[PDB]
Write a protein that binds this ligand. Structure first.
Ligand code: C8E
Ligand code: C8E
Ligand code: C8E
Ligand code: C8E
Ligand code: C8E
Ligand code: C8E
Length: 137
């Protein structure tokens, strides 16, 4: 994990489920100790051919543990404010907003002290994503 009392920022590519949606996101966080950090994220998803767009902003606690010196397993839990925009040909544009709990599980690999990648599955009550972050130290 990032050094205690330090910040990080990252970006991701995401995918959820015919129907496939792809998009991207950004996140920023503050690490307290090797097991606990907090993060704020923004992600969007768009429907791929053969406007359905969704966006969400979230704030979560991130709890993790080192599987190895370089690999952490982690979970995130918190809330998300979302917006989904639609485009119909009959009814024009539309959108709905909501608030929901949000969860995630993932693995993060510290490539260098400054750079880490992550692989995550996020769900609510899913979206797979790959990302990279920069640790300010
Ligand atoms: C931005 C995409 C990131 C996706 C990479 C995650 C891939 C890593 O492996 C995770 C496990 O593989 C899961 C497979 O996808 C679900 C399969 O079934 C879907 C069709 O019904
Ligand atoms: C939610 C946006 C989608 C995420 C896009 C991925 C972009 C990843 O971040 C790129 C790396 O960060 C930028 C670096 O700072 C230097 C840029 O040049 C300076 C200003 O002109
Ligand atoms: C549900 C998650 C809520 C999000 C948590 C917000 C976390 C709050 O901010 C963390 C960043 O603020 C930094 C702390 O102050 C510095 C502490 O003194 C340093 C040495 O112990
Ligand atoms: C999804 C997996 C992530 C689950 C998060 C784990 C929660 C983090 O805190 C666990 C408690 O921290 C204690 C661990 O360090 C100590 C162990 O014993 C010492 C060496 O043998
Ligand atoms: C507790 C559930 C709510 C989650 C808190 C998130 C609160 C954050 O602010 C939400 C309002 O801000 C609007 C977001 O759109 C802009 C985001 O940043 C742009 C892309 O990088
Ligand atoms: C103590 C280690 C940290 C692990 C705690 C993380 C807690 C994670 O679980 C939260 C509960 O998960 C929510 C699941 O319910 C919704 C599932 O999807 C709807 C059916 O397909």
């Amino acid at each position: 994990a990032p050094k205690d009392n330090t910040w990080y920022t990252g970006a991701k590519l995401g995918w959820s489920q015919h129907e496939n949606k792809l998009g991207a996101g950004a996140f920023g966080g503050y690490q307290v100790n090797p097991y606990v950090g907090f993060e704020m994220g923004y992600d969007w998803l768009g429907r791929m051919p053969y406007a359905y767009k969704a966006q969400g902003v979230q704030l979560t606690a991130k709890l993790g543990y080192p599987i190895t010196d370089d690999l952490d397993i982690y979970t995130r839990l918190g809330g998300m404010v979302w917006r989904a925009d639609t485009y119909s040909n009959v009814y024009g544009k539309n959108h709905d907003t909501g608030v929901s709990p949000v969860f995630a599980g993932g693995v993060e690999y510290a490539i260098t002290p400054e750079i880490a990648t992550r692989l995550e599955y996020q769900w609510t009550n899913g979206m797979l994503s790959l990302g990279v972050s920069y640790r300010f130290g």
